[PDB]
From a paper:
O-acetyl serine sulfhydrylase (OASS), referred to as cysteine synthase (CS), synthesizes cysteine from O-acetyl serine (OAS) and sulfur in bacteria and plants. Results show that CS uses a noncatalytic residue, M120, located 20 Å away from the reaction center, to discriminate in favor of substrate.
Similarly, M92 interacts with main-chain carboxylic group of T69 with the distance of 3.5 Å and M96 interacts with main-chain carboxylic group of S70 at a distance of 3.7 Å. On-rate binding constants of mutants of HiM120A, HiM92A, and HiM120 AM92A are ∼286-fold, 80-fold, and 200-fold lower than that of HiCS wild-type. However, OAS binding-induced fluorescence quenching of M92A mutants shows species dependency with StM92A showing 62% quenching as compared with 1 to 5% quenching of HiM92A and MtM92A mutants. Mutation of M92 also affected the substrate recruitment although to a lower extent.
Author numbering:
A (entry chain X), B (entry chain X): 2 to 311
The structure:
Amino acid sequence: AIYADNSYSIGNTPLVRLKHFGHNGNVVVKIEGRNPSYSVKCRIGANMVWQAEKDGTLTKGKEIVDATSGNTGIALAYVAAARGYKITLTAPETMSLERKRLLCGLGVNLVLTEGAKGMKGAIAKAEEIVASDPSRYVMLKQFENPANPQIHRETTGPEIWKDTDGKVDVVVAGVGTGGSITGISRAIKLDFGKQITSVAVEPVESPVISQTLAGEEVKPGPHKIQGIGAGFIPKNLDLSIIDRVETVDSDTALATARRLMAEEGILAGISSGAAVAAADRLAKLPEFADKLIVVILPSASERYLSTALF
Amino acid sequence: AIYADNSYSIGNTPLVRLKHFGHNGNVVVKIEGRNPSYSVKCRIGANMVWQAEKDGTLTKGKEIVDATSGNTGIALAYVAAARGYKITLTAPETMSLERKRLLCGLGVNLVLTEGAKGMKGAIAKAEEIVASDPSRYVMLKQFENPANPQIHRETTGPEIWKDTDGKVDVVVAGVGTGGSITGISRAIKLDFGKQITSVAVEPVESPVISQTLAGEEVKPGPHKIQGIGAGFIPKNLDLSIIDRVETVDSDTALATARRLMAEEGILAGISSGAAVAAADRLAKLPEFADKLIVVILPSASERYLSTALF
């Protein structure tokens, strides 16, 4: 029916079958670009704010502070705007000027730090701002805030189960904060009782989950797959539900993304191309030929036009 | 469940209540930016192609030719890509270079005409290309192709009826091709038996529907409300279901659009700001205080960032 504000309109994203990936239709994609803010992060921007209200840490008057690497800050921005919260978001001068303006036009009180050290400064500034008056601010902390995976367990997971009628066999998701694969896996494995195969995807340039699980020295490193590869293990990544970890390089993630536009008519971001390249690999293994593979496409295309993707 | 391709995933867009427009919640918006291609036009790109198949004019091998003023060409582009059709789209050198590239990355064989005369050349080229071999091409003709309003009568209309439980009293829609208000109005007035108020919206700069219905000389003229104000009466505009015509100027359409971002957390285009300004006007008339007003928001924000809107 009718949503009280734009925060409630999250989710119910479509599953679509791919024709030029997989084997006789075993790869189906879940299009999270089909959301407010054009990415999966709307789901956690909404729920981290709802939960902060449920527990009283968010009150009719307090101000949201956070630092953001991109999609999340827009999510929180639109939810704050929808629900009428002051929001401060911190980000260095290493930022897109189209990303600055979007945030600003969202009523974000944007904090511009120095580029140099990277995101460690703006994040430090984000705790710094809170440190001034903790009673005035609340930092939502997507990497460790459990409301992040709990929304995927409550929505994104059941949506997958429902739309496939319980027939999903594998789920393929890149990991940034890890909340996606976590919430979904728990949903399907624990609430819906089905021992699916949960596949984490990361960049071959910064393969810290793979290096970790194999006891190998952890060596994070630069990459272009925007949205994943945080370069450490996030607290919202539960390695206990991860069955398999696939790595994908940036160039293949791009080529796959472009390929989805030109052949599938699906316009998604570099991270969505990374996830499909991972799922395609598995789908074309005789052990997965009969199984139903569900791949999360984290974001939509038109918010990557001016980096590499175009 | 699972869509065979991205064309089938159109529609089921949300209704959201506005908090800073209308009077005690009588204005609710339908967010058509929440679609593949990020606009309502995905609905006609999909259906004009489906219907052309139903009637045999589109065959496994023919090529789509059309000229486009923007959103429609992306819609057709993604549907052609999804359904595996060659598409030629014509457009002058008066085009966004980010709009060119999106189309190109969609596998569009783009035709670049001369700017000078405007869109009359690229359209003429679009018939010109067909004129070479009509057996090779098919021109879908959104302004007069009835599959355009029939999709809104089949989907967008019933979605409104269903989500409001039949309680919608007024529908507010800007008119470009007119298919939106047409299909929706017929749906609700004729199929669902309810004598709602259908309100067309146009720019005060090019008020040809208003000048027409009042017998006044028709004087189209330049405007910035992208998506509406075609500067003539389209064949897919049935003035027989239009109860009222509101005009809105470009500056107010912008301000209203920005206002939806900053206060509602709804990121939409200039034409969506035009439609809400029209609906807000009516909503604050004592005669509409009790009635439920539904406003179509035709497109999403991130595809206007680089003109005026930002």
